[PDB]
Design a protein around this nucleic acid. Sequence first.
RNA 1: CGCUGCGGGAUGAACCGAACGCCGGGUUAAGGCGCCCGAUGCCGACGCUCAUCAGACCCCAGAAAAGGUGUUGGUUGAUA
RNA 2: UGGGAUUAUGACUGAACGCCUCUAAGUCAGAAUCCCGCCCAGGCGGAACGAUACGGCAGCGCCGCGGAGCCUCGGUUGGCCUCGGAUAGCCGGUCCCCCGCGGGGUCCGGUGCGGAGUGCCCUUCGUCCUGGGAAACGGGGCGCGGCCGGAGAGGCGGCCGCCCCCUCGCCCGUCACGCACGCCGUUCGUGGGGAACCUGGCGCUAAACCAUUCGUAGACGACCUGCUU
Lengths: 199, 95, 109, 138, 101, 145
Amino acid sequence: QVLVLDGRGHLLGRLAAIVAKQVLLGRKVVVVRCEGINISGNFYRNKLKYLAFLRKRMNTNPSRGPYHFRAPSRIFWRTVRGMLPHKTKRGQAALDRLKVFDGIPPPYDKKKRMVVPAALKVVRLKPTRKFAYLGRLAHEVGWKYQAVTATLEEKRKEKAKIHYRKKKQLMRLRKQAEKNVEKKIDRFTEVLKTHGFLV
Amino acid sequence: MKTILSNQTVDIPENVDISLKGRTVIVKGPRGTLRRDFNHINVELSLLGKKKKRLRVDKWWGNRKELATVRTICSHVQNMIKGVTLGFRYKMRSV
Amino acid sequence: SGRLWCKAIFAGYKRGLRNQREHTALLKIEGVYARDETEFYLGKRCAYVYKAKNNTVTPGGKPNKTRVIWGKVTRAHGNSGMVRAKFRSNLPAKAIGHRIRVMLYPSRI
Amino acid sequence: VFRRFVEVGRVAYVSFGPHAGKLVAIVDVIDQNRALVDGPCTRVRRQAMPFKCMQLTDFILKFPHSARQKYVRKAWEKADINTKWAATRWAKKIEARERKAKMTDFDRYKVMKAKKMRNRIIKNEVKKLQRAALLKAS
Amino acid sequence: FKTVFAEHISDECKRRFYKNWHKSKKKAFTKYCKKWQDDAGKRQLDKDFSSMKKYCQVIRVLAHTQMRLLPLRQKKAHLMEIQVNGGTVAEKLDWARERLE
Amino acid sequence: ITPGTILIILTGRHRGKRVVFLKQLSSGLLLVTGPLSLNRVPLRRTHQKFVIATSTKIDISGVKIPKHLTDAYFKKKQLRKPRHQEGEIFDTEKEKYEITEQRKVDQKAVDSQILPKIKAVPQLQGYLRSVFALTNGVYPHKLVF
RNA sequence: CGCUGCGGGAUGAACCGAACGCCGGGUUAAGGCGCCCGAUGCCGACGCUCAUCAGACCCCAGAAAAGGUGUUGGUUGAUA
RNA sequence: UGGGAUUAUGACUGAACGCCUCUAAGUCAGAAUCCCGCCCAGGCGGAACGAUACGGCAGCGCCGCGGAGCCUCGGUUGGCCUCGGAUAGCCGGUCCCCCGCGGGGUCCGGUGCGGAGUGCCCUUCGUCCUGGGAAACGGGGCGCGGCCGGAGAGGCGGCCGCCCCCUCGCCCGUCACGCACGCCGUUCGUGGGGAACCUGGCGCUAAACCAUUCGUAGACGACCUGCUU
Ligand SMILES: [Mg+2]
Ligand SMILES: [Mg+2]
Ligand SMILES: [Mg+2]
Ligand SMILES: [Mg+2]
Ligand SMILES: [Mg+2]
Ligand SMILES: [Mg+2]
Ligand SMILES: [Mg+2]
Ligand SMILES: [Mg+2]
């Protein structure tokens, strides 16, 4: 029903395009952890592109002008808006299927998350190149909450490793019982083996 | 062009022991220990001999620039061994 | 006691860039992402269902509020599992991105 | 770090192309990205094939860097790759991946009824070991 | 996150509510003040100070003035939040919980 | 489609059921008995194109189908002209369908000698009491029948 | 061209294709196939190139002389 | 009125090019510039707390339910979760040691074009009678009690003791179940969302604006304030 995407290790534009397509096609999409997003090109290169945008503003009343959002969440939004017909209705509903966040909030910290192999950095670039993190970049241009958002992900990790040990414990038990009562399930095991399961 | 292989080697004296978690070198000796990472070069490091006598660094399929790094790793290691075994002293004068 | 139909998405009309030919449609099917694997779904009947304010007839039932438009799958729109289709009365354009049904009836399997 | 090499006499598996699903051997290296290739005992003529096509196996043979393929036939049959090859698990995974797709509807039913019971038992067993540990945790 | 008021709040503070104090019935904090002379309210309010020790980082205190003591025509008090700055959260709650009222 | 094959119906009221094929008549329509005990589906006529054939089969060659069973026998019978032609009427001559005995006799005499052959295959009953459907991750062009 | 619409050139008097009764089906030209936007969601082929102003498709809407142990190719002449 | 990243520049280590070299990889200092701070305003932007209408007729909230009727559309099993690496990873043992039964590392054993596989996993959807064989005590009558976190935007669920009740998973034996006579919107989230008609207990009793007054306020609007005590 609903699709969730961890953005750690992705690239900005190659992700956005895949999103905008699905979104127009009825799907509801949720992008998470937008501070892990990377960009091609070194830091200085990319900083200028953003700072040059901050010097575009209506001379006569910049209470009206281009609004220069700072956060990683809102930047990824502002990107995708460049790939849609936002000045028409079906464009405007598309935006309202998308939710973006920075960090992993409580609804979605207990759900499995997807990845695209087509917009990853290890796949689309050569390792002898440069790249930049969008989290750092916002901090330099006035994003004020890089520092608590860190503490909150730490606490998240401190609880997930708990969950995995429980899950990792139980697998041992699942596996031990199999080899104990094998004499009782020896018949139903075979047919699975004959048809491509359990082998 | 591209070339298939380039490699270079470094020896170790008996007093010293080193180890590696991939591209993360651990040195230890008389004057303590040192730790340094080379996870940004893309080479293969190996360590062979009786009690790891000798080290070689090698690279496959590289350009002119990418080959230039192979000796540079080795030069750093010679410096680290020397420091933990002997230690560096620089003198400065006033005028 | 369950679903007996395959699911699809109404993506838009046949078009160029600055024109439309509203008398034929394009359809995006699930699991179908290559031209080689569309020959199954040829000749088969489609449908777009919706609910209206007034009651209407039903064959073998009481007058519920549903309504349909019928179809026929025709051919393939290029390399990637997209499809073309035609109906009786051209679609409304509020259906874009919604769900239509692909049946299995003219079987040759 | 590396364990598998591109050598003269290194065996490989073709994953996509006209000849996918077939073993073959390497004979000589043409360039950075191409090789001269042969499998006689798998119905594969001598031809060129790139490296992006095939994966490297842990088997290897012994012959010089160009022969007349009567010799390649010997070394192949000498070591009995065919028997060794189906021994692997890798291959058994390919064999099983076949059979699932060939599986018809009556076969797809009997599996349903079997898979069900298998998991009833295993869950009902795991329930017991938990209690035993919770009360032997003392 | 959460807030607490005391048990007795004089009228000059209650005039900050109630734009028209003249034709009102003055039924403010009448039900909230009943869980101080109670048993479960003692359990209900004190289950909350524990949270604030645990899930909070910043403490502020509500205070108001004494307007009887002035010559002015006015009677309404002025409220304001003030920040407590010190060592740790638990200290500031104890310091304030004593200093209340 | 060959005598003894098993077929999925997918249009009517007896929808999505699994049945058994006897033979083809002289009108292009197929004769089906999803044996009444199991599927609750009798001798009927069905169209060869509104159905799927499975790759699952049995041996039926030894079996006695009567001569009198025809397209003239599986015919509907309604549309009676002697009517008032005025009122809240005109589908009122019992309004309903009622079964003759001759049909019963026919169903019994056949399934008597069909059914033992079925039980010669294990688990072939649950397949003929179940119902077909689609679910998540089951694309039909992929699955072979 | 003016008297002449249409597909492409983001837009457009003349540039490229092609000239018009009203409709159905198929195929093309010139251009093109990340998303806006129809179509490569080919397991496409061989190389080049990193820019603290990168480059990006006739008409066409922006730049030269001279230079550079930046890097890849080549010619000539010498030395081992 | 205070900081952060860096320019121009000067330096470290160090290859290519045995040597040399501020650069190729990798580091350091660095400014009336830049961004933020302090400072002004506060979004078709959220939050916590208070009180919630008995008058000559009135009227509302919560819980629990029986029938109906209007308007607005979607949909047609579910997936309750390690972190991260990529010229390397995963599991088990934890033989051996470190951090307060837990986690970190060395040494070992298996796996690795990932079978402790999302090319995946769970879940069965014809009902009923009895009459035999393998595998077996699970649940709840909006059931009997407490523990919590959750606190990043829960709008969230979970594990031991009782009043009761029952025989469901697999394989065979025996039949019944409108067999509606070839056919379209069948089949589930659904007691959906919003108003109006609506059937008993447990609980509730007020505010804003105008007129009036004040001048710290003011073109008029607005704003600060006082008056049955
Ligand atoms: Mg419906
Ligand atoms: Mg003319
Ligand atoms: Mg044009
Ligand atoms: Mg132009
Ligand atoms: Mg274009
Ligand atoms: Mg500074
Ligand atoms: Mg510099
Ligand atoms: Mg610095």
